Design a protein around this ligand. Sequence first.
Ligand SMILES: [Tb+3]
Ligand SMILES: [Tb+3]
Ligand SMILES: [Tb+3]
Ligand SMILES: [Tb+3]
Ligand SMILES: [Tb+3]
Ligand SMILES: [Tb+3]
Ligand SMILES: [Tb+3]
Length: 523
Amino acid sequence: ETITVSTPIKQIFPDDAFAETIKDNLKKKSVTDAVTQNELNSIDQIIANNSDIKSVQGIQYLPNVTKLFLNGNKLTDIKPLTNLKNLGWLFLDENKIKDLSSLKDLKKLKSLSLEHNGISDINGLVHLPQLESLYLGNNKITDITVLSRLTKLDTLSLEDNQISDIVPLAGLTKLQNLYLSKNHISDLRALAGLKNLDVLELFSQECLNKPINHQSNLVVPNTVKNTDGSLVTPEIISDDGDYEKPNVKWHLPEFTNEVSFIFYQPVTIGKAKARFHGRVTQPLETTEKTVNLTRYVKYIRGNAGIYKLPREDNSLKQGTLASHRCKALTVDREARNGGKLWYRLKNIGWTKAENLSLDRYDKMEYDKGVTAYARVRNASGNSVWTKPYNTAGAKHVNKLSVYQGKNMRILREAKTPITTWYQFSIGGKVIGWVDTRALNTFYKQSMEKPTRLTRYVSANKAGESYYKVPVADNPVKRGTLAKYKNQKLIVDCQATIEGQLWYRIRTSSTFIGWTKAANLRAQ
Ligand SMILES: [Tb+3]
Ligand SMILES: [Tb+3]
Ligand SMILES: [Tb+3]
Ligand SMILES: [Tb+3]
Ligand SMILES: [Tb+3]
Ligand SMILES: [Tb+3]
Ligand SMILES: [Tb+3]
């Protein structure tokens, strides 16, 4: 593309600073002056370094430019260069150019410089197979796969980038100048064949591993390889770490963020010396037996069987609880088999919780004091006490036998868990309580059945007396019949005791008492 009629510079080159540079180039006076295409065509070189140039629009009118130095500017676009075929030298350091799709048709390009352009994608360069010098230092490059095509390069610079994989260079045997410092390289095997190197730089590498769990024995494979394939021995290992065969080892007893080692190894490939150095960072029957109770087995059910283990099987019955009936005891090892709770008696076997109780039972459940008369019916085995056996204050009184034969007056009643008790007296004086089944109450009120018969007193029975109850014991004697000698007697009640007939007499006036019918007359 070109202009026909003369035209001013400013009219063609929008970017002032760039117009200015043209002016000087064409030796012109002022940016205003006009120029012809033929004057534009006479331009083959352009040196505009650090010229605060934001754009180069219009440079499409210099079809014969071959050298172009625009280092240290403010460019970001290069679409104008697109058709500048004869371009052979092109420097664009310190700029912000990222779209390279404009360089694909510059097949005569010999040397390219793009240092400090904040580049990361360079797949575009693949169209410049004839390049001889390439500068990409200080960018954000990680993948140099496409450089494998640039087999005419003798000079290549990629330092201060994020490169890790350099296999893409294994074939560039034509290389003489190679800069790879400040990258993430840790393997130089890929460089083993560059026999034509004169300049080689590999210092300050930063290699970051993938995090691993922290340990106290920590072991990390040394992954730094020489051109050879041999492991590079670590110069300086952090945290007092040591180095064995191919592993770097740490003792890290406590815990730390990361660990690391430093490598420094002079290498030579071709006729070039270099220092391969950098750092590698490594990110990192139920029994409740603890109790002691104080219980007293319920006197009753003293036929409670004791077992070895909390189970109800006679084959495991250690015996029978009954020999320990009235003592303060101590359990310990509790339990719960089949749902029911069991107990372990100190030194004694195992029984059920029901069987054992809280304290020395005494509850009589009632103390009445009815009316009756008994006689010891086999004392063999029983005694007489202060208030029913197994009861507060209940002391002792002679054996039951000590009262046999004699008539005992029933004064009271009782009924504790085992049996019913009868307080009693003899000769009027009270004695105590006794198991009612040991006695024979030959007389009970329930035996007093009513009637309505009439009688008088016997002249021969006048000496006989009458009582309060149909029992001829002195303590219940209430008088002598002879007091009624010839009065009318009304027999209202009656009772048959020990086979004899008694009547309860009374005058139409006053109540008399009980007397044997054998002493009266209806006559
Ligand atoms: Tb302008
Ligand atoms: Tb530089
Ligand atoms: Tb540099
Ligand atoms: Tb450098
Ligand atoms: Tb050489
Ligand atoms: Tb040490
Ligand atoms: Tb640390």
